[model samples]
Target: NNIHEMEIQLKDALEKNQQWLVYDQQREVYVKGLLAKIFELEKKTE
Candidate 1:
């Protein structure tokens, strides 16, 4: 299960990390390559 009542902390972490997902348009062509891997990992976990 998740953090029960500490859901706000988890929610904040997600908001912060989501920016990293979008912040890399400055690094290379696009983040689509790495994004796919993150999505794949999430999928594999379930």
Candidate 2:
């Protein structure tokens, strides 16, 4: 359930096309890791 909030914010960030997602490879790696965990958590909930 808590992950729902994270999912929303993640979608919002993606919707905005945040520069960090592209301007910096380092953050891209970190953000990808966050997305991976969110996906994993979502699967666990299902």
Candidate 3:
């Protein structure tokens, strides 16, 4: 999926704002961490 799709999902998560997950802070961090891991793996393949 595209970044736009990811953004929508993140927005929904943020609106819900459950105890298990907070949207404003943790969501961004979580996405960034996931993207960083993906980038690292891609770099290894190159």
Give the TM-score of each candidate.
0.42, 0.46, 0.45
lDDT of 2 by residue, 1-46 (tens): 8899999989988967766646687777889999999999999999
Task: Give the top-scoring candidate (lDDT).
Answer: 2
The numbered model that scores best in TM-score is 2
lDDT of model 2 at position 39: 100
- Ranking of all candidate structures by their TM-score, best first: 2, 3, 1
Write candidate 3's Cα lDDT for 1-46 as tens digits: 6999999999888767774555557888888999999999999997
Using TM-score as the yardstick, the better of models 2 and 3 is 2
* Candidate 1, 13-45: lDDT as tens digits: 899888876676555555676788899999999
- Candidate 3 residue 27 Cα shift, in angstroms, is 0.7
Candidate 1: give its CA RMSD in angstroms. Answer: 14.4
User: Poorest 10 consecutive residues of model 2 by lDDT?
Assistant: 15-24
Which window of 10 residues has the lowest lDDT sum in candidate 3?
A: 15-24
